[PDB]
Design a protein around this motif. Structure first.
Motif, PDB file in Angstrom:
ATOM      1  N   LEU A  64     -11.492  16.846  -2.858  1.00  0.00           N
ATOM      2  CA  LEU A  64     -12.146  17.214  -4.093  1.00  0.00           C
ATOM      3  C   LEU A  64     -13.588  16.654  -4.076  1.00  0.00           C
ATOM      4  CD1 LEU A  64     -11.612  18.879  -6.696  1.00  0.00           C
ATOM      5  CD2 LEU A  64     -11.170  16.623  -7.931  1.00  0.00           C
ATOM      6  N   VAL A  65     -14.547  17.538  -4.405  1.00  0.00           N
ATOM      7  CA  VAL A  65     -15.999  17.231  -4.475  1.00  0.00           C
ATOM      8  C   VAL A  65     -16.471  16.550  -3.189  1.00  0.00           C
ATOM      9  CG1 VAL A  65     -15.951  17.268  -7.070  1.00  0.00           C
ATOM     10  CG2 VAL A  65     -16.032  15.072  -5.967  1.00  0.00           C
ATOM     11  N   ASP A  66     -15.746  16.843  -2.105  1.00  0.00           N
ATOM     12  CA  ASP A  66     -16.034  16.364  -0.739  1.00  0.00           C
ATOM     13  C   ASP A  66     -16.101  14.852  -0.625  1.00  0.00           C
ATOM     14  OD1 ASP A  66     -16.571  18.840   1.041  1.00  0.00           O
ATOM     15  OD2 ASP A  66     -17.576  17.150   2.136  1.00  0.00           O
ATOM     16  N   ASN A  67     -15.353  14.177  -1.489  1.00  0.00           N
ATOM     17  CA  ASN A  67     -15.440  12.736  -1.490  1.00  0.00           C
ATOM     18  C   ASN A  67     -14.056  12.205  -1.242  1.00  0.00           C
ATOM     19  OD1 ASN A  67     -16.094  10.024  -1.930  1.00  0.00           O
ATOM     20  ND2 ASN A  67     -16.867  10.371  -4.023  1.00  0.00           N
ATOM     21  N   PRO A  68     -13.826  11.543  -0.092  1.00  0.00           N
ATOM     22  CA  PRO A  68     -12.496  11.027   0.167  1.00  0.00           C
ATOM     23  C   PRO A  68     -12.109   9.993  -0.863  1.00  0.00           C
ATOM     24  CG  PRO A  68     -13.702  11.182   2.209  1.00  0.00           C
ATOM     25  CD  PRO A  68     -14.677  11.493   1.116  1.00  0.00           C
ATOM     26  N   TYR A  69     -13.069   9.432  -1.611  1.00  0.00           N
ATOM     27  CA  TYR A  69     -12.710   8.473  -2.655  1.00  0.00           C
ATOM     28  C   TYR A  69     -11.872   9.112  -3.760  1.00  0.00           C
ATOM     29  CZ  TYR A  69     -15.403   4.232  -1.443  1.00  0.00           C
ATOM     30  OH  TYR A  69     -15.943   3.103  -0.848  1.00  0.00           O
ATOM     31  N   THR A  70     -11.836  10.440  -3.794  1.00  0.00           N
ATOM     32  CA  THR A  70     -11.092  11.107  -4.831  1.00  0.00           C
ATOM     33  C   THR A  70      -9.662  11.243  -4.471  1.00  0.00           C
ATOM     34  OG1 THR A  70     -11.270  13.386  -3.972  1.00  0.00           O
ATOM     35  CG2 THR A  70     -13.035  12.635  -5.519  1.00  0.00           C
ATOM     36  N   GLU A  71      -9.308  10.996  -3.230  1.00  0.00           N
ATOM     37  CA  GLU A  71      -7.966  11.270  -2.736  1.00  0.00           C
ATOM     38  C   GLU A  71      -7.076  10.028  -2.844  1.00  0.00           C
ATOM     39  OE1 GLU A  71      -5.445  13.038  -1.741  1.00  0.00           O
ATOM     40  OE2 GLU A  71      -6.079  13.843   0.187  1.00  0.00           O
ATOM     41  N   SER A  72      -5.990  10.180  -3.595  1.00  0.00           N
ATOM     42  CA  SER A  72      -5.024   9.135  -3.847  1.00  0.00           C
ATOM     43  C   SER A  72      -3.930   9.220  -2.787  1.00  0.00           C
ATOM     44  CB  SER A  72      -4.329   9.324  -5.219  1.00  0.00           C
ATOM     45  OG  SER A  72      -5.248   9.533  -6.271  1.00  0.00           O
ATOM     46  N   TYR A  73      -3.509   8.057  -2.349  1.00  0.00           N
ATOM     47  CA  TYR A  73      -2.471   7.979  -1.344  1.00  0.00           C
ATOM     48  C   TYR A  73      -1.490   6.969  -1.953  1.00  0.00           C
ATOM     49  CZ  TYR A  73      -5.732   4.136  -0.534  1.00  0.00           C
ATOM     50  OH  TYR A  73      -6.633   3.080  -0.707  1.00  0.00           O
ATOM     51  N   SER A  74      -0.481   6.625  -1.175  1.00  0.00           N
ATOM     52  CA  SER A  74       0.474   5.654  -1.608  1.00  0.00           C
ATOM     53  C   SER A  74       0.425   4.410  -0.719  1.00  0.00           C
ATOM     54  CB  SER A  74       1.834   6.344  -1.630  1.00  0.00           C
ATOM     55  OG  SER A  74       2.846   5.432  -2.020  1.00  0.00           O
ATOM     56  N   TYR A  75       0.334   3.255  -1.336  1.00  0.00           N
ATOM     57  CA  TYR A  75       0.402   2.078  -0.519  1.00  0.00           C
ATOM     58  C   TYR A  75       1.112   0.977  -1.289  1.00  0.00           C
ATOM     59  CZ  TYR A  75      -2.708  -0.255  -3.604  1.00  0.00           C
ATOM     60  OH  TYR A  75      -3.238  -0.728  -4.764  1.00  0.00           O
ATOM     61  N   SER A  76       1.415  -0.127  -0.615  1.00  0.00           N
ATOM     62  CA  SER A  76       1.834  -1.295  -1.389  1.00  0.00           C
ATOM     63  C   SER A  76       1.264  -2.620  -0.866  1.00  0.00           C
ATOM     64  CB  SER A  76       3.371  -1.346  -1.497  1.00  0.00           C
ATOM     65  OG  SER A  76       3.900  -1.304  -0.177  1.00  0.00           O
ATOM     66  N   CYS A  77       1.242  -3.588  -1.775  1.00  0.00           N
ATOM     67  CA  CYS A  77       0.873  -4.954  -1.471  1.00  0.00           C
ATOM     68  C   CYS A  77       2.050  -5.928  -1.548  1.00  0.00           C
ATOM     69  CB  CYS A  77      -0.154  -5.433  -2.472  1.00  0.00           C
ATOM     70  SG  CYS A  77      -0.810  -7.023  -1.997  1.00  0.00           S
ATOM     71  N   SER A  78       2.387  -6.574  -0.425  1.00  0.00           N
ATOM     72  CA  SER A  78       3.337  -7.707  -0.415  1.00  0.00           C
ATOM     73  C   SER A  78       2.758  -8.951   0.261  1.00  0.00           C
ATOM     74  CB  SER A  78       4.630  -7.331   0.298  1.00  0.00           C
ATOM     75  OG  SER A  78       5.653  -8.230  -0.095  1.00  0.00           O
ATOM     76  N   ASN A  79       2.630 -10.037  -0.519  1.00  0.00           N
ATOM     77  CA  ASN A  79       2.030 -11.319  -0.072  1.00  0.00           C
ATOM     78  C   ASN A  79       0.811 -11.064   0.805  1.00  0.00           C
ATOM     79  OD1 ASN A  79       5.433 -11.998   0.735  1.00  0.00           O
ATOM     80  ND2 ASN A  79       4.517 -12.661  -1.251  1.00  0.00           N
ATOM     81  N   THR A  80      -0.216 -10.467   0.211  1.00  0.00           N
ATOM     82  CA  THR A  80      -1.460 -10.417   0.924  1.00  0.00           C
ATOM     83  C   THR A  80      -1.497  -9.349   2.021  1.00  0.00           C
ATOM     84  OG1 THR A  80      -2.536 -12.513   0.492  1.00  0.00           O
ATOM     85  CG2 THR A  80      -2.360 -11.886   2.857  1.00  0.00           C
TER      86      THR A  80
END
Ligand SMILES: CCCCOC(=O)c1ccccc1C(=O)OCCCC
Ligand SMILES: [Ca+2]
Ligand SMILES: [Ca+2]
Ligand SMILES: [Ca+2]
Ligand SMILES: [Cl-]
Length: 124
Positions: A64-80
């Motif tokens: 979207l609007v040629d900006n990868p910053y617009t693209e949501s992905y899935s991640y997680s944080c465990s102890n750093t």
């Protein structure tokens, strides 16, 4: 997506206010960049910038609007530790890795306070 990268940084460096710590640092941390990075933190940022430039070259991927910053992905944080979900599609996984590699890089690079709000017109 941009918000998830800030949140990744807070994952890897729990002390940090990402927007205030890493935005407008050096020549590369920030909108665009120019010249040669001033230290290894700035080079993490230059590498992130180029990671995004590559993702935009993935004929597979149209952000979207040629900006990868617009693209949501899935991640997680465990102890750093950051994990990119394996169920992210190829474009999402690419962006997820740009952001994770950058958060981990920021976490191990010395933070030089003289380089926050560098005069980039002069030094970059
Ligand atoms: C393709 C148009 C660029 C759009 O601006 C952004 O997404 C942007 C928005 C807020 C904070 C940082 C950035 C950034 O650092 O983006 C880096 C892109 C530089 C061209
Ligand atoms: Ca940044
Ligand atoms: Ca940049
Ligand atoms: Ca998505
Ligand atoms: Cl940021």
């Amino acid at each position: 997506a941009l918000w998830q990268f800030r949140s990744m940084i807070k994952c890897a460096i729990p002390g940090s206010h990402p927007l205030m710590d890493f935005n407008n640092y050096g020549c590369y941390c920030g909108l665009g960049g120019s010249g040669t990075p001033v230290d290894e933190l700035d080079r993490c940022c230059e590498t992130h910038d180029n990671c995004y430039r590559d993702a935009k070259n993935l004929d597979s991927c149209k952000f979207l609007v040629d900006n990868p910053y617009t693209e949501s992905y899935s991640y997680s944080c465990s102890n750093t530790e950051i994990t990119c979900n394996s169920k992210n599609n190829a474009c999402e996984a690419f962006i997820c890795n740009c952001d994770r590699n950058a958060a981990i890089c920021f976490s191990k690079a010395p933070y030089n306070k003289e380089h926050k709000n560098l005069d980039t017109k002069k030094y970059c």
